[PDB]
């Protein structure tokens, strides 16, 4: 038996069912594009189960006794095993709606609702968007300007170089302040779409005004192509960095998040993901333990209290879960 919630089981970075999980995740993504949130979550959960299995699924008899494997997800896997291909998945892959929604939603600053609006309005290509600049936010204009680099996978080598410049800037602005790599790279991923850093300082309040100073330093080194600073709920800067490379450079998306140290463990847990892992952890918290978990805290709605955590381990323990290190949160 395998546990129901993704937060009750390890899900490693690498697994034995990548074809099958990829196919289910296409159907999940397509569901999300049509605003079908139930169906998205259902396909995502089924894919997550396959990622946690210790062996490849070679016959359909191997699906027995697994949670979150309803009829639809089972049929998809059956067709893949029997025929090498699933007609429904192939139809989605080839469909103009899916291809265009994927194209648009990938762009920096574009979500499903915006992409769907553009689709409905007859826009299909990146050139179409460039022909209608009045339809674009400044963030989206920047995403289009750099779209080729931003759809080139970010590599661990890029992350190391970025972490060095961010750490240098943070250390020069405020000795004692720290930078923690989060997101998929903290989970062990070799590649990604962006780089996530969480900044804090051990004395509560000493992080105030730090991010604009960090950004000034980075901007004055020529490292920033785009920056949008927002005070609000954590202070954050949504950035495109200009990463120097041997003979050239590439644009890379970087999010910088500042958390006061009291909230740091919650922020680190939240920002480390995976997105499905954290959704599952929050559902577990609410449904099984009666507590509301988010990136800022863990709230008991009946007692009107907040849990004091020094680490992620504290939070897992308080929720009655075995601790999972970040590399086992790849749900």
Ligand X SMILES: Nc1nc2c(ncn2[C@H]2C[C@H](O)[C@@H](COP(=O)(O)OP(=O)(O)OP(=O)(O)O)O2)c(=O)[nH]1
CA nearest 199: which of 181, 213, 218, 223?
Answer: 181
The number of helix segments (H) and strand segments (E) in the chain equals: 15, 10
The angle subtended at Cα 253 by Cα 99 and Cα 258, nearest 5°, is: 130
Shortest approach of ligand X to residue 191 CB, angstroms? 7
Q: Which of 29, 116, 158, 196 binds ligand X (CB under 6 A)?
A: 196
- Residues in the chain, overall count: 331
Check the annotation: does 196 bind a ligand. yes
Check the annotation: does 220 bind a ligand. no
Site of interaction with Mg ion (CB under 5 A): 183-184, 192, 194, 196
Check the annotation: does 128 bind a ligand. no
Q: Which of 135, 295, 318, 321 binds ligand X (CB under 6 A)?
A: 295
Q: How do 154-155 and 191-192 pair as beta strands?
A: antiparallel
Q: Which stretch binds ligand X (CB under 6 A): 20-28, 208-216, 266-274, 303-311?
A: 266-274
Q: Is 196 a catalytic residue?
A: yes
Q: Is 255 a catalytic residue?
A: yes
Residue 217's binding partner, choosing from Mg ion, ligand X, none, with beta-carbon cut-off 5 to 8 A by kind?
none
Q: Which of 29, 116, 158, 194 binds ligand X (CB under 6 A)?
A: 194
If binding is defined by CB under 6 A, does position 282 make contact with ligand X? no
Sheet with 178-181, side-by-side order of all strands: 178-181, 195-200, 248-258, 235-245, 224-230
Q: How many CB atoms lie within 10 A of CB 22?
A: 13
If binding is defined by CB under 6 A, does position 273 make contact with ligand X? yes
Give the CB-nearest residue to ligand X: 273
If binding is defined by CB under 6 A, does position 143 make contact with ligand X? no
Q: Which stretch binds ligand X (CB under 6 A): 6-14, 53-61, 72-80, 181-189?
A: 181-189
Shortest approach of Mg ion to residue 223 CB, angstroms? 18
Residue 43 and residue 27 in contact, taking contact as beta carbons nearer than 8 Å:
yes
Residue 206 and residue 161 in contact, taking contact as beta carbons nearer than 8 Å:
no
Residue 274's binding partner, choosing from ligand X, Mg ion, none, with beta-carbon cut-off 5 to 8 A by kind?
ligand X
* DSSP code for 153: P
CA nearest 271: which of 291, 252, 294?
Answer: 294
Can the peptide bond before residue 307 be classed as cis, meaning omega within 30 degrees of 0?
A: no
Shortest approach of Mg ion to residue 95 CB, angstroms? 28
Q: Is 160 a catalytic residue?
A: no
Shortest approach of Mg ion to residue 108 CB, angstroms? 13
Give the CB-nearest residue to Mg ion: 183
If binding is defined by CB under 6 A, does position 183 make contact with ligand X? yes
Residue bearing tokens 């709606």: 97
> How remote is the C-alpha of 285 from its chain's centroid?
20
Q: Which of 128, 149, 255, 314 is catalytic?
A: 255
Q: Give me the phi and psi of 191, to 5 degrees please.
A: -140, 175
When the beta carbons of 89 and 198 are compared against ligand X, the nearer one is 198
When the beta carbons of 18 and 125 are compared against ligand X, the nearer one is 18
If binding is defined by CB under 6 A, does position 283 make contact with ligand X? no
Q: How far apart are CA 197 and CA 141, in angstroms?
A: 24
Which residues participate in catalysis according to the annotation? 194, 196, 255
Instruction: State the binding site.
Output: 194, 196, 255
């Amino acid at each position: 038996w395998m546990p129901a919630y993704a937060c009750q089981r390890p899900t490693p970075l690498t697994h034995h069912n990548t074809g099958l999980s990829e196919a289910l995740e296409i159907l999940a993504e397509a569901a999300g594009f049509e605003g079908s949130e139930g169906r998205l979550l259902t396909f995502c959960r089924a894919a997550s189960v396959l990622k946690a299995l210790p062996s490849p699924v070679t016959t359909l008899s191997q699906l027995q006794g697994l949670p979150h494997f309803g009829e639809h997800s089972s049929r998809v896997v059956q067709e893949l095993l029997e025929h090498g291909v699933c007609e429904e998945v192939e139809r989605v892959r080839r469909s103009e709606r899916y291809q265009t929604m994927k194209l648009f939603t990938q762009i920096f600053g574009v979500g499903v609702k915006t992409a769907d609006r553009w689709y409905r309005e007859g826009l299909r290509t990146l050139d179409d968007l460039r022909e209608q600049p009045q339809k674009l936010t400044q963030q989206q204009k920047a995403g289009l300007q750099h779209h080729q680099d931003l759809s080139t996978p970010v590599l661990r080598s890029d992350v190391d170089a970025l972490q060095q410049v961010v750490e240098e800037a943070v250390g020069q602005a405020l000795p004692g302040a720290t930078v923690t790599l989060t997101g998929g790279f903290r989970r062990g991923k070799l590649q990604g779409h962006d780089v996530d850093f969480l900044i804090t300082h051990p004395k509560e309040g000493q992080e105030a005004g730090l991010l604009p100073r960090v950004m000034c330093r980075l901007q004055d080194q020529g490292l920033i192509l785009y920056h949008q600073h927002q005070h609000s709920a954590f202070e954050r800067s949504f950035c495109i960095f200009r990463l120097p490379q041997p003979g050239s450079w590439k644009a890379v998306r970087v999010d910088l998040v500042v958390a006061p140290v009291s909230q740091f463990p919650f922020a680190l847990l939240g920002w480390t993901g995976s997105k499905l892992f954290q959704r599952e952890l929050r559902r577990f918290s609410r449904k099984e333990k009666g507590l509301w978990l988010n990136s800022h805290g863990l709230f008991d709605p009946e007692q009107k209290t907040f849990f004091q955590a020094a680490s992620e381990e504290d939070i897992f323990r308080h929720l009655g879960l075995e601790y999972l290190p970040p590399e086992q949160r790849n749900a």
